[PDB]
Amino acid sequence: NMFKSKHKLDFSLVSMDQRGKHILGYELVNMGGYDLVHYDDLAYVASAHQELLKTGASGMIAYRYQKKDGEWQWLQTSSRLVYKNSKPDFVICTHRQLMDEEGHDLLGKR
Amino acid sequence: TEFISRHNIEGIFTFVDHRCVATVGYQPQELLGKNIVEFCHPEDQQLLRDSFQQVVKLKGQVLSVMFRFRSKTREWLWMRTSSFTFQNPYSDEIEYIICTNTNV
């Protein structure tokens, strides 16, 4: 139920595990990092993005990502800044696919 | 009673949540790809257009505009739309404009 993705500092996707591609139903590159974020989770994801940029790490306990068929996928994600020659280079995310029950339970705790 | 829509900086619908079906009578796919002003009463369009341009200019500030929205039943529905641009936390580029569209 776990997979990884790699992103520019602005969170646009540059690569993702094939397992993550099949969960979301998709290409997935050539897309902005916020185009699939559920509108009720935009603030939550943007706040984690700032945590990642200022701190080098962030955690999102639950948020929704729109799948190809239009349905929402609940996700739980850790993010980390990867550096290169002492400068921020890219972002690596580790995701866990959440069922809707656990996602809605975590939504109220986030 | 409201629904959320996302727009590019020109006003084109790029996402609409399904609450639009009950609020204004269209399916989301009927709105996607059209400009918001195409659903606006002719007398209200200039105010809508300038409000949308100002949302983009005042990156991040939340603005409000009232205008008549043309429902699928071909009635003019008075709408209050709260809008803001979402800025990318790294690049500060405008990703899109978020509108909360409420029948009044």
Residue numbers in the entry:
A (entry chain B): 269 to 294, 298 to 381
B (entry chain D): 361 to 464
Please quote the authors directly.
The aryl hydrocarbon receptor (AHR), a member of the basic helix–loop–helix (bHLH) Per–Arnt–Sim (PAS) family of transcription factors, plays important roles in regulating xenobiotic metabolism, cellular differentiation, stem cell maintenance, as well as immunity. From the N- to C-terminus, AHR comprises a basic helix-loop-helix (bHLH) domain for DNA binding, two tandemly arranged PAS domains (termed PAS-A and PAS-B) for dimerization, and a transcription activation domain12. The ligand binding site of AHR has been mapped to its PAS-B domain. Here, we present multiple crystal structures of the Drosophila AHR PAS-B domain, including its apo, ligand-bound, and AHR nuclear translocator (ARNT) PAS-B-bound forms.
To characterize how dAHR PAS-B binds mARNT, we determined the crystal structure of dAHR PAS-B in complex with mARNT PAS-B. The crystal asymmetric unit (ASU) contains two dAHR PAS-B and two mARNT PAS-B molecules, which form two closely related heterodimers with a rmsd of 0.34 Å over 212 aligned Cα atoms. In the heterodimer, the two PAS-B molecules are organized in a roughly parallel orientation with a total buried surface of 1160 Å2. dAHR PAS-B:mARNT dimerization is predominantly mediated by hydrophobic interactions. Three hydrophobic residues, Y305, Y310 and L313, of dAHR PAS-B interact most extensively with mARNT PAS-B. The side chains of R366, N448 and Y456 of mARNT PAS-B form hydrogen bonds (H-bonds) with dAHR PAS-B W343, D278 and D306, respectively. Interestingly, all the observed H-bonds are facilitated by carbonyl oxygens rather than the side-chain atoms of dAHR PAS-B. Of all 11 dAHR PAS-B residues participating in the interaction with mARNT, 9 are conserved in mAHR and hAHR, suggesting that the AHR-ARNT PAS-B interaction pattern may be highly conserved among these species. The superimposition of apo dAHR PAS-B on the heterodimer gave a rmsd of 0.78 Å, indicating that no significant conformational change appeared. Compared to the WT protein (380 nM), the binding strength of Y305A to mARNT was largely decreased (1800 nM), while it was only slightly decreased for Y310A (500 nM). The superimpositions of dAHR PAS-B:ARNT with HIF-2α:ARNT, NPAS1:ARNT and CLOCK:BMAL1 gave rmsd values of 1.4, 1.3 and 5.8 Å, respectively, indicating that the overall structure of the dAHR PAS-B:ARNT PAS-B complex is very similar to that of HIF-2α:ARNT and NPAS1:ARNT. The C-terminal tails of HIF-2α and NPAS1 PAS-B wrapped toward the interface, making additional contacts with ARNT PAS-B, while the C-termini of dAHR PAS-B pointed in the opposite direction.
